[PDB]
């Protein structure tokens, strides 16, 4: 029996209902990046419609009980949100996919520092419970803002998708565990999956996706539709950014300082085609230098190198000193 051409498919998947299967050029499984999908979904849910209106009203509670709670716990542990979000403790401890990807792509320090940061706290917490990280460690924990953790998270997720998740083809499968238990014995993977039945071929065109309009809209201003050129728009934008900074202490600035909006406007002007000399040349130079440095991947200098070992056998494993004429 063929799943396609089955009676249900013949009766339902017909041109009359626009449910016909359409065959196009071959394309990879997992065609949609998860990070982009979540970006668009978040924008649609928060900044549009009745759902957006409801979720905007809940910004205080969500910020208090989902962001500052995690941040407070991490700071108590001498950690940041990165330590809990860039690589989940589940992946850090036991995950073979993460282990293989890290071994094949990542430098050891990228995860060694993550592990040692938690080792700092848990060498004391397990010995004596209730450990509160002292101020000096908490300071270095607080130094890093969320604006860099988000960059790391997006970089890692995009790399994982473009390199590994984009080169995977799932298949129908039986129980992974070779367990004699009958309940595990007859586990069937492949049915009850939406992806399994949505497309029966690798040539089928994709029937559900985000429209280009939504994708472009999700890349606009997260805070709202403003006009930074007019003074009225800038005032509202600054008000919203100030309340955001208040809600999230270590998101973009230290919890005691204020955000520099002139530098942000200079960055926006430089990035887009709009330009002018309303900013000081020093400001423009500083902004350009900061932009260059932020996008610069660190490289090795090849300096201050330690000495490599060339071990030799000890003296007792070598012949004695004397050497006379053999004959």
């Amino acid at each position: 029996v063929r799943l396609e051409k089955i009676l249900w498919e013949q009766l339902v998947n017909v041109k009359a209902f626009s449910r016909q299967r359409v065959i196009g050029a071959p394309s990879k499984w997992y065609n949609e990046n998860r990070t982009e999908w979540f970006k668009v979904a978040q924008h649609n849910a928060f900044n549009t419609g009745f759902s957006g209106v409801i979720l905007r009203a809940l910004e205080p509670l969500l910020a208090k009980f989902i962001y500052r709670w995690r941040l407070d716990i991490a700071h108590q542990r001498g950690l940041t949100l990165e330590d809990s979000l860039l690589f989940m403790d589940r992946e850090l401890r036991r995950c073979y996919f993460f282990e293989t990807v890290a071994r094949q792509n990542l430098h050891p320090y990228t995860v060694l520092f993550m592990k040692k940061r938690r080792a700092r706290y848990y060498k004391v917490e397990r010995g004596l419970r209730g450990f509160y990280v002292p101020d000096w460690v908490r300071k270095e924990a607080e130094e890093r803002q969320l604006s860099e953790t988000v960059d790391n998270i997006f970089n890692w997720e995009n790399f994982v998708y473009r390199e590994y998740m984009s080169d995977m083809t799932p298949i129908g499968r039986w129980t992974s565990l070779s367990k004699i238990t009958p309940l595990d014995m007859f586990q069937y993977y492949g049915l009850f999956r939406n992806e399994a039945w949505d497309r029966f071929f690798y040539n089928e065109a994709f029937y559900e996706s985000y429209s280009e309009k939504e994708k472009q809209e999700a890349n606009g201003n997260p805070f709202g539709k403003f006009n930074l050129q007019t003074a009225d728009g800038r005032a509202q934008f600054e008000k919203e950014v100030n309340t955001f900074i208040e809600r999230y202490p270590f998101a973009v600035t230290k919890p005691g300082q204020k955000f520099d909006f002139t530098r942000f406007y200079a960055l926006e002007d430089l990035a887009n085609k709009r330009d002018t000399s309303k900013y000081d040349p020093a400001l423009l130079e500083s902004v350009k230098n900061e932009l260059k440095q932020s996008a610069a991947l660190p490289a090795d200098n090849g300096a201050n190198k330690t000495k490599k070992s060339k071990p030799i056998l000890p003296d007792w494993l070598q012949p004695k000193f004397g050497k006379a004429f053999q004959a």
């Binding site: 299967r21 065959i23 080169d167 298949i171 071929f201 040539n203």
Partner: protein, 482 residues
């Protein structure tokens, strides 16, 4: 033209594939081919190709090893070499010069049911080749001294036959499959009898076998049909007509003899195993269906296919390639379909490390028998496309000429590309299952294993395990283990 765009996908109205009856547009066209018969019975077929740069002439004579006896075994090997040695018109030096001038691309294939002589030359001298080819095979003079000289060469060839391991294993499966018929004896002949051949034996063989009714001359490439036909008639009009009074040995059906042979040799590092079923003759109704089965099984290499390019062996549409990729050391696998006038053999030959002996022993049957119960449409379409491409891939003049000659000899007709495509494309999963159960399900086997047999000695006899291998899901017990 169907439409403006050659690369259109409109006709693919079945989920990206053509429907059951339809065929690709490229295969809807057939090159011209004219077949004629002469008074002597020699059949001339021409399939010209003006654009091609070469012309190939293939002469197929239905004489073969089948027409030999124990007291005259190996006379075909002497015949093939002696024909070039000399002729009444031309000495050895003269024919050697003539062969060199038009290129050394002369291939002599001494088969069991027939012998083929294929010569590929330039278009401007193709006629000359015919004049040569007709003479060399017709007026050859077999001297005693020449036979004495060639005895050593024939004996060395017989001894060296072991160099081509696949060929020697094919000869072994022929020997084991037909034990009560001379058709089982090796093509190179019995070694100890090679020195017993005389000039008179060769002369009698050629006189009683090279008859007008046994000659088919096929031509392909840049060849002028009229000129080639006229020249071939002039050349081959002097061949003696077949005589009924003459006696042709071994004219009865070589009934298939199931068996299991084991050439145990523990100093080879590798094992050559072959498992074959009785297969239809060239005229059986299930001929192109079994060719489709051959395409389904296909061939495998350890440096290609699932053994080299995939994340996992499961991600493909060839069932046998999955298993072969799962086995690191099973290196070579090829499905051979050899049809003859009376009988035929369809089977699989594996070559690989002896540690996977049983895996190579029980695999070929398991897949084939499984097709008797269920075959996925993906495999059907894969084999369909492969057969289409191979049909469109016959371009070399020598290969096409040899195929034309063989088709004429076994059918007295040139089967066109379109007809073959229509025949194979009409196959369905149900038809595939019915053919497989007719020919493969619960059927007898001819098995040969050559090489280190320390693992296989225990089951070296035709027993229950071998008996149930030709079943489907019942009998895979031994394959999976190890």
């Amino acid at each position: 033209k169907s439409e403006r765009l050659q690369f259109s996908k409109a006709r693919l109205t079945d989920f990206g594939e053509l429907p059951q009856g339809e065929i690709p547009t490229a295969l809807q066209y057939d090159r011209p081919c004219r077949v004629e018969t002469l008074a002597n019975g020699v059949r001339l077929a021409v399939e010209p190709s003006s654009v091609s740069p070469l012309a190939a002439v293939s002469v197929v004579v239905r004489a073969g090893t089948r027409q030999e006896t124990l007291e005259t075994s190996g006379v075909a090997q002497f015949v093939q070499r002696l024909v070039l040695r000399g002729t009444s018109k031309r000495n050895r030096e003269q024919i050697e010069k003539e062969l060199a001038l038009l290129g050394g691309n002369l291939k002599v294939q001494v088969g069991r049911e027939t012998t083929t002589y294929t010569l590929s030359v330039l278009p401007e001298n193709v006629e000359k080749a015919v004049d040569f080819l007709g003479d060399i095979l017709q007026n050859s003079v077999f001297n005693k001294q020449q036979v004495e000289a060639e005895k050593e060469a024939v004996y060395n060839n017989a001894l060296s036959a072991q160099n081509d391991q696949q060929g020697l294993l094919l000869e072994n499966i022929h020997f084991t499959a037909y034990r009560d018929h001379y058709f089982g004896q090796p093509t190179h002949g019995i070694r100890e009898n090679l020195h017993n051949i005389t000039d008179e034996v060769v002369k009698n063989f050629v006189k009683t076998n090279y008859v007008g009714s046994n000659f088919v001359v096929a031509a392909a490439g840049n060849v002028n049909s009229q000129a080639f036909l006229q020249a071939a008639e002039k050349a081959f009009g002097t061949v003696a007509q077949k005589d009924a009074t003459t006696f042709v040995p071994n004219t009865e059906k070589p009934y298939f003899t199931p068996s299991y042979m084991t050439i145990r040799d523990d100093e080879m590092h590798n094992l050559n195993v072959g498992v074959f079923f009785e297969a239809p003759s060239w005229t059986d109704p299930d001929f192109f269906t079994i060719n489709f089965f051959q395409r389904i099984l296909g061939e495998y290499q350890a440096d290609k296919y699932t053994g080299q390019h995939l994340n996992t062996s499961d991600r493909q549409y060839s069932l046998i390639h999955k298993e072969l990729g799962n086995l690191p050391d099973v290196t070579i696998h090829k499905t051979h379909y050899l049809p003859y006038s009376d009988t035929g053999l369809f089977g699989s030959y594996f070559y690989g490390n002896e540690i996977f002996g049983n895996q190579m022993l029980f695999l070929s049957q398991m897949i084939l028998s499984e097709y008797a119960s269920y075959i996925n449409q993906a495999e059907i379409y894969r084999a369909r496309a492969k057969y289409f491409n191979e049909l469109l891939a016959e371009q070399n003049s020598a290969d096409i000429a040899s195929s034309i000659a063989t088709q004429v000899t076994y059918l007295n007709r040139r089967v066109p590309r379109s007809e073959v495509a229509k025949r194979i494309s009409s196959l369905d999963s149900g038809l595939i299952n019915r053919a497989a159960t007719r020919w493969f399900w619960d059927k007898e086997l001819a098995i040969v294993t050559w090489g280190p047999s320390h693992g296989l000695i225990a089951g070296s006899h035709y027993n229950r395990s071998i008996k149930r291998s030709t079943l489907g899901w019942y009998g895979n017990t031994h394959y999976y283990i190890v």
